[PDB]
Amino acid sequence: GEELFTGVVPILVELDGDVNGHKFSVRGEGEGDATNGKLTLKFICTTGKLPVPWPTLVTTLVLCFARYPDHMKQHDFFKSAMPEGYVQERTISFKDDGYYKTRAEVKFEGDTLVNRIELKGIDFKEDGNILGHKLEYNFNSGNAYITADKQKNGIKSNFKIRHNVEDGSVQLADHYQQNTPIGDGPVLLPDNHYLSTQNALSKDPNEKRDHMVLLEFVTAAGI
């Protein structure tokens, strides 16, 4: 599926979520430039105030736009499953607090790459950093390690995100991740490698709704 990603591709992201029983919705749009591993997106909470901090949703809210160097083309599972796409599931455990469970489908609809997500949040503390909105509006660079899962004909990943808390401490979020193709055509199963990421969060000054402007770079390495 790499031929689908040679130019700038429009992106649509749709998340329906439920944290401690409170429902919310997020809608995002922008574009991706896999040649440079670059993502540009704006997200809106369409139901009102977002009940969790925006930084906790970044990883949930399209790894097919990662820049895989020419010599790593054979380890790019994400593009290889396209256009039918893949299912991406995660558990995200916030240390000393609740956890997210997410199931998403990432696939083309026409010329648009769509990420459509169901999220459940369970056992969060009313006075914790999530429901209490105590996390700084920023995001730290990191690496995410990719390993093949032959039994499922997909990949797996685990990694740690560290969210800056407004008092100066750090809130760890352990990610466990599993990806499986939607179609039954052949996909590329990679050798071990990792993805290196940079992120910049900002605000639209003309936007009155609760929102997040996001720019992200993702590059494959380690082989």
Automatic annotation (TrEMBL):
<comment type="similarity">
    <text>Belongs to the GFP family.</text>
</comment>
<dbReference type="InterPro" id="IPR009017">
    <property type="entry name" value="GFP"/>
</dbReference>
<dbReference type="GO" id="GO:0008218">
    <property type="term" value="P:bioluminescence"/>
</dbReference>
<protein>
    <submittedName>
        <fullName>Green fluorescent protein</fullName>
    </submittedName>
</protein>
<dbReference type="InterPro" id="IPR000786">
    <property type="entry name" value="Green_fluorescent_prot"/>
</dbReference>
<dbReference type="Pfam" id="PF01353">
    <property type="entry name" value="GFP"/>
</dbReference>
<keyword id="KW-0599">Photoprotein</keyword>
<dbReference type="InterPro" id="IPR011584">
    <property type="entry name" value="GFP-related"/>
</dbReference>
<dbReference type="GO" id="GO:0006091">
    <property type="term" value="P:generation of precursor metabolites and energy"/>
</dbReference>
<keyword id="KW-0455">Luminescence</keyword>
<keyword id="KW-0157">Chromophore</keyword>
